[PDB]
């Protein structure tokens, strides 16, 4: 029960997912081939939150892989754990997208939105009472932003109540790699804000930090950034899939963490994170976890939270705890930083505990923060926009597909308001 469906869209979304479904698949003991070789009868008990049965004892996941360039959908299929998506699920147009948001929300996607909106319904009715759609997608490219946001505003009209996730990788100036981010992003966010109820902002600057400093790698290929955002995703939903001593689901977090209707731009994080040359020089019990977890250098979202205040905070633990450790650590790190947690909300830290670790470890914790610090993430974007748009630079490639000029101002105002209304709580 409590089933979740999964939508990927963009080169990001797909290369994140092909790792996601490798961590998930090895939690539940699933081979590549769909067969099963678990060891504990606990794994195969909620197998049907991210999976479907198929004859002969094969298990096939609930993916909807989407993108507008038919190369990605082949790269996925040859990787390890590729035999597994059942092939009708992919949906690929064949004309690329071209880092132009317009061509994903009006023209070259509007004629692909249905061959996916017509696989969600095929995959929304083999389930008893489902719970939400995940949507993992880079907010910078052309498919991801425009095509994905369109997909989302179509999904939120045939299902106006189920819950809605997004794992959106965000632009960052110090590792920027395209020249029209500040149109892609500020156009995408004017429509994530009205049509989702939780959004985990990963971004690549910080995700690089976390592998230079902490995990102390010579060379971070992308295969070791996606392998952290995968673990945050695997975390935020670990009570739906295992027995726990204080259960929390997407609905739990999405009611305890959102203190008004709009402010739902969380930032994730994960702990432990040890360069496994350094691992024998640190034995973690609960407090080591909860102190690494609130470090300025384990916010996968690029901002320093000290210039802001955590409005609300969540902590989804996994492993055998002793729950007063959890409770008193949280009271500790709530009374040590009395100036970093907002006052007029008491007991800011929601907790939860699962019971199986991620395999190979013994204790892990997935932090989900909601800080007013994001005041700065959407702020720098606006600069890199309010100069570019102020000279209609790069503008024609957008008017050429139908958008108006006005629509840009709409987005701009509607992402300046938001910053204003984190700023009150500062």
């Amino acid at each position: 029960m409590r089933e979740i469906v999964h939508i990927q869209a963009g080169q990001c979304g797909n290369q994140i997912g092909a790792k996601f479904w490798e961590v998930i698949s090895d939690e539940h003991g699933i081979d590549p081939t769909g067969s099963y070789h678990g060891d504990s009868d606990l794994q195969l008990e909620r197998i049907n939150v991210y999976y479907n049965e198929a004859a002969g004892n094969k298990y096939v996941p609930r993916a909807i892989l989407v993108d507008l360039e038919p190369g990605t959908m082949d790269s996925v299929r040859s990787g390890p754990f590729g035999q597994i998506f059942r092939p009708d699920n992919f949906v690929f147009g064949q004309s690329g997208a071209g880092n132009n948001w317009a061509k994903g929300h009006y023209t070259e996607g509007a004629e692909l939105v249905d061959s996916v909106l017509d696989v969600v319904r095929k995959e929304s009715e083999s389930c008893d009472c489902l719970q939400g759609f995940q949507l993992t997608h880079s907010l910078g490219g052309g498919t991801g932003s425009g095509m994905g946001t369109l997909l989302i505003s179509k999904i939120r009209e045939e299902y106006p109540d189920r819950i809605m996730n997004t794992f959106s990788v965000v632009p960052s100036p110090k590792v920027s790699d395209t020249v029209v981010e500040p149109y892609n992003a500020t156009l995408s966010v004017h429509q994530l804000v009205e049509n989702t109820d939780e959004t985990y902002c990963i971004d690549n600057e910080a995700l690089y930090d976390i592998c230079f400093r902490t995990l102390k790698l010579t060379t971070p290929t992308y295969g070791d950034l996606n392998h952290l955002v995968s673990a945050t995703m695997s975390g935020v939903t670990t009570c739906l899939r295992f027995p726990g001593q204080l259960n929390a689901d997407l609905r739990k977090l999405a009611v305890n963490m959102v203190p008004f209707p709009r402010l739902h731009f969380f930032m994730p994080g994960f702990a432990p994170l040890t360069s496994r040359g350094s691992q024998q020089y640190r034995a973690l019990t609960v407090p080591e976890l909860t102190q690494q977890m609130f470090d300025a250098k384990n916010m996968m979202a690029a901002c320093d939270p000290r210039h802001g205040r955590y409005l609300t905070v969540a902590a989804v633990f996994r492993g055998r705890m002793s729950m007063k450790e959890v409770d008193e650590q949280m009271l500790n790190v709530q009374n040590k930083n009395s100036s970093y947690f907002v006052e007029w909300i008491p007991n800011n830290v929601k907790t939860a505990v699962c019971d199986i670790p991620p395999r190979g470890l013994k204790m892990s914790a997935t932090f989900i923060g909601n800080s007013t610090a994001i005041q700065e993430l959407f702020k720098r974007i606006s600069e890199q926009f309010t100069a570019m748009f102020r000279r209609k630079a790069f503008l024609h490639w957008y008017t050429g597909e139908g958008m108006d000029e006005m629509e840009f101002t709409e987005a701009e105002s509607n992402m300046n308001d938001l910053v204003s209304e984190y700023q009150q709580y500062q």
């Binding site: 064949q94 690329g96 880092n99 590792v175 920027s176 029209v180 060379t219 102020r390």
Partner: protein, 439 residues
């Protein structure tokens, strides 16, 4: 994984192309006589090369070219060389006479007899393709075929097809070295073409490439068959992401809305590094943070203008080889700080990286080294507005005495079609003057 057609006009065109294709057929394993030594043809989707080839029967591969020239003399070296078997002997068009550096003679009078035979071997090729990306139109602003005949081929290709991407690699008159007394008429005359009916116009001069061959490559007595190979690897990299797997791909349409800040301002000027000799190799361990620095020296710009005096308005950096995508970030970092590399304000974003996995490939008996990394900036700028100004001070004289006008008005044109082209290379100059001022 999708395909693009190539046109060659003029003889500089054809000979740029000779090397283009000797290189392409080496990047994929395609021997001189059309074959690729093959396998058991088990498949289910097999498009390893298709973008510059087409498979036909029994194992033969045939390229997609349209070689065109009115001179009947250059093509024959093709038709009997070592590339005999391979091209399709009904593509290489060959007229009767040559225009003889008379522009008016490639537009109508000696060219009205070949467009209808070349539009046809275009359209029989634009329909053996499933979906089509772009038209690479190699030509040469210098002579006469490549100035009139192309201004005809491009206009036809822009009202029949209409909305495609039409690229353009074109040799420009140098400021000092020249080989035609009537070049500064051709040039100013083909400007009405490279504004209304094309999008990217990668100009490349000649004295510049000559330098790039004498200072870096340790060859002091070059020939045209050693400038064309460099102008060939620029093209094996601007179209190196349609054709191989990538860790961060950039497709022949992504390029443009990354690279063109307005409808008209679209003349980038390319670059390339490493260009190192055979023995000046081992004293370099040329890792990424270095080859991204060679690109901004105002002594590797393949178009002899000074980029220091100017302001960039975009860039694009198509690295390739063994490049992992953090080093590029530290590299672009270093570049972003410097003085005397002045990015304009209204583009604070700055760059557009793009990486591939295939090493740039070598051509036997060539003059480049087996490097394991490469890069080809394509950096729009404002500095280029100081090359065209030169040709203006080479035309507001040869026209004040109507010199050489007779050969031109003789074949239909009129005295006005000169002052039109005047004002229309004057506006382009005013506009790069404008978009550089800070607001």
């Amino acid at each position: 994984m999708r395909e693009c057609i190539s046109i060659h006009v003029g003889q500089a065109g054809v000979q740029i192309g000779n090397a283009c294709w000797e290189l392409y057929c080496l990047e994929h394993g395609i021997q001189p006589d059309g074959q690729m030594p093959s396998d058991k043809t088990i498949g289910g989707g097999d498009d390893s090369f298709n973008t510059f080839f087409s498979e036909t029967g029994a194992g033969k591969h045939v390229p997609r070219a349209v070689f065109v020239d009115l001179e009947p003399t250059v093509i024959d070296e093709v038709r009997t060389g070592t590339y005999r078997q391979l091209f399709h002997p009904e593509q290489l068009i060959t007229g009767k006479e040559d225009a003889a550096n008379n522009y008016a003679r490639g537009h109508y009078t000696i060219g009205k007899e070949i467009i209808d035979l070349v539009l046809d071997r275009i359209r029989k090729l634009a329909d053996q393709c499933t979906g089509l990306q772009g038209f690479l139109v190699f030509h040469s602003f210098g002579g006469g075929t490549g100035s009139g005949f192309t201004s005809l081929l491009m206009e036809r290709l822009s009202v029949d097809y209409g909305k495609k991407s039409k690229l353009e690699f074109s040799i420009y008159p140098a400021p000092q070295v020249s080989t035609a007394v009537v070049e500064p008429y051709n040039s100013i005359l083909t400007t009405h073409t490279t504004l209304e009916h094309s999008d990217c116009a990668f100009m490349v001069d000649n004295e510049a490439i000559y330098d790039i061959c004498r200072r870096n490559l340790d060859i002091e007595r070059p020939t045209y068959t050693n400038l064309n190979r460099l102008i060939s690897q620029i093209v094996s990299s601007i179209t190196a992401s349609l054709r191989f797997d990538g860790a961060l791909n950039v497709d022949l349409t992504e390029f443009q809305t990354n690279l063109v800040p307005y409808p008209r301002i679209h003349f980038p000027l390319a670059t390339y590094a490493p260009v190192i000799s055979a023995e000046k190799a081992y004293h370099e361990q040329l890792s990424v943070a270095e080859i991204t620095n060679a690109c901004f020296e105002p002594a590797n710009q393949m178009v002899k203008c000074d980029p220091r005096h100017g302001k960039y308005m975009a860039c694009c950096l198509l690295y390739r080889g063994d490049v992992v995508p953090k080093d590029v970030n530290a590299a672009i970092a270093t570049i972003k700080t410097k003085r005397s590399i002045q990015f304009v304000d209204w583009c604070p974003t700055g760059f557009k990286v793009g990486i591939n996995y295939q090493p740039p490939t070598v051509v036997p008996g060539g003059d480049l080294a087996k490097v394991q990394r490469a890069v080809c900036m394509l950096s729009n700028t404002t500095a280029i507005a100081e090359a065209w100004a030169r040709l203006d001070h080479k035309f507001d004289l040869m026209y004040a005495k109507r010199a050489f006008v007779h050969w031109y008005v003789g074949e239909g044109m009129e005295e006005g079609e000169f002052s039109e082209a005047r004002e229309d290379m004057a506006a382009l100059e005013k506009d790069y003057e404008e978009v550089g001022v800070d607001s």
